[model samples]
Target: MEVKIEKPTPEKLKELSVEKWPIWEKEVSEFDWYYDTNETCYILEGKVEVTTEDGKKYVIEKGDLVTFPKGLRCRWKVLEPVRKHYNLF
Candidate 1:
């Protein structure tokens, strides 16, 4: 599955109803990651570059919304510490 990233409009954010999901806050130093399931998150603070196994890369930072699809294997280069709100689906 492809990774999806969006800078949601105010109305779009409302339609997402993301506040209903539980927040997953984290503060991790640079590390690699593998997605076992679909994960969607709103970044509260951080700077990171996520390079997928196929070589596609995504840059995420504070106030950005990101999704890592199921079965996607990726390596994370954390440029800054991370704090996020997330949910798995």
Candidate 2:
């Protein structure tokens, strides 16, 4: 997909909603397929466990900043219910 990536400011992120994404996570289980492109994420609450396609894992917690560039696949498993804001370009 052709998307224009944008910089996400803190104030805008705070106004977003926290919803369940069946496309990825469940209450206690989350299986995700992370693919390439550009996306930026700001953690609002809780934490998210992300595993890259290369088998690298990272825990993105509240107040953490992250970004995924083109040509990467990542799987996200939320250990706790996560509240986050994202902008995919």
Candidate 3:
């Protein structure tokens, strides 16, 4: 598995845009292998539990900022219902 992660820089933020996803808890169970060549999540409301290939895990909540770079692989476990915006490079 390949993990490409980057901190959100001004240049990166400038290139990023946001839109919402109304994902419900019922929509996911276990983990899904999902990625995008140009998309990464920016969580706004509710809770999201994601894990890296190396087994490092994250529990992201309100006000937390992170990035999943292009070609990064992971599991998105939405612990609660969420409405988030994503940017696709």
Candidate 4:
């Protein structure tokens, strides 16, 4: 599984606005996660560190655009409460 994280460009954010996606929110915490389907999200709040099964790590925070690939197995360490707009496929 390949997880991608990036700082969204103004054009990109405009194109993928939260108005077009569903919003999901979570409180600060740490837990295991599994993605059965691909997911793309735009973070609106908080910070997180994700560690994959192979030990690859990614740090993402507010204003970031992130993609968690299908079949990904990882652990999520939420450094602060998180709120995001997301889409699943």
Best by lDDT: 4
Stretches of candidate 2 off by over 4 Å are 1-26
Candidate 2's residue-wise lDDT over 11-85, tens digit each?
A: 645455323311222354577865466766666677667876667677776777566777676677878887655
* Clashing pairs in model 1, backbone N/Cα/C closer than 3 A: none
* lDDT per residue (tens digit) for residues 1-89 in model 3: 34434345545544654433323233434475656665555555787677877788777776454555567677778788665566556
Which residue pairs does candidate 3 place in steric collision?
none
Best candidate, TM-score-wise?
4
Q: List the lowest-lDDT window of 10 residues for candidate 3.
A: 19-28
Residue pair clashes in candidate 4: none
What does candidate 4's lDDT look like per residue over 1-89, in tens digits?
38888886768677766577988888788999889998998888888888987888787877788888888889989988888888998
In order, candidate lDDTs are 0.77, 0.60, 0.59, 0.84
* Stretches of model 4 off by over 4 angstroms after superposition: none
Give the higher-TM-score candidate: 1 or 4: 4
Better of 1 and 4 by lDDT: 4
**Relative to the unseen true structure, what is the Cα RMSD of model 3?**
4.6
Whole-model lDDT, model 3: 0.59
TM-score of each: 0.77, 0.63, 0.61, 0.87
lDDT score for residue 28 of model 4: 86
TM-score of model 4 relative to the true fold? Answer: 0.87
